[PDB]
Design a protein around this ligand. Structure first.
Ligand SMILES: O=P(O)(O)O[C@@H]1[C@H](O)[C@H](O)[C@@H](OP(=O)(O)O)[C@H](OP(=O)(O)O)[C@H]1O
Ligand SMILES: O=P(O)(O)O[C@@H]1[C@H](O)[C@H](O)[C@@H](OP(=O)(O)O)[C@H](OP(=O)(O)O)[C@H]1O
Lengths: 106, 106
């Protein structure tokens, strides 16, 4: 499963607020129980990472609709096992749910 | 880049005709200069291989429209560097070309 998604890094480990918190349009790929980030589809096929980011494991990840986040629509929350938390924005709700199911079933 | 494609194993290394030559509907994923095969999208996210197949490298691969193959339409040919050759069938020509560009640019 892959596609573009607006992403925001919210939390880091140990209840620390992430220092880098602006939204960025990234091309996401769910494969082999992990999620990789690329600038676009072409970088994804070539294996060139978003910002030297390493793919993250979706093992025991918590993924759900971000009701609490109100600054925008179709936003879902992803908390990785290591404590990092991201907010992802999809084009509409159907896609949002498509992503939530994909991740929750990895 | 990923999606379902009908696949046929044509050639093996050393100008040997592949022994296993029936068409099979497989879910293909182009990521990090390689191509993985899965039974479906869900197996792809989970990392469960098509038939214990290992992803193949697209490094120096030859990919083109299979003019010579006439038994069906929208079929492209992929020759890997190690000698293996596969024929892939897409739903239409646009998608076929989409796949040919994706692979040729990996
Ligand atoms: O450009 P900067 O320095 O990174 O600033 C951030 C940016 O404007 C984010 O869009 C904003 O998130 P929200 O849009 O979601 O408000 C975040 O606020 P935040 O502190 O609420 O996280 C800002 O700190
Ligand atoms: O079921 P089997 O034993 O695997 O038989 C093959 C199967 O019917 C393939 O569809 C056919 O390819 P084509 O459809 O493309 O004709 C192939 O012929 P082939 O020898 O031409 O490769 C057969 O050998």
């Amino acid at each position: 499963m892959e596609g573009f998604l607006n992403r925001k890094h919210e939390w880091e480990a140990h209840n620390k607020k992430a220092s880098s918190r602006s939204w960025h349009n990234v091309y996401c790929v769910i494969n082999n129980q992990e999620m990789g980030f690329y600038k676009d589809a072409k970088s994804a096929a070539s294996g060139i990472p978003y910002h030297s980011e390493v793919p993250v494991s979706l093992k025991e990840a918590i993924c759900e609709v971000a009701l609490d986040y109100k600054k925008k629509k179709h936003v879902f929350k992803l908390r990785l096992s290591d404590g990092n938390e991201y907010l992802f924005q999809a084009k509409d709700d159907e896609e949002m749910n498509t992503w939530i199911q994909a991740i929750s079933s990895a």
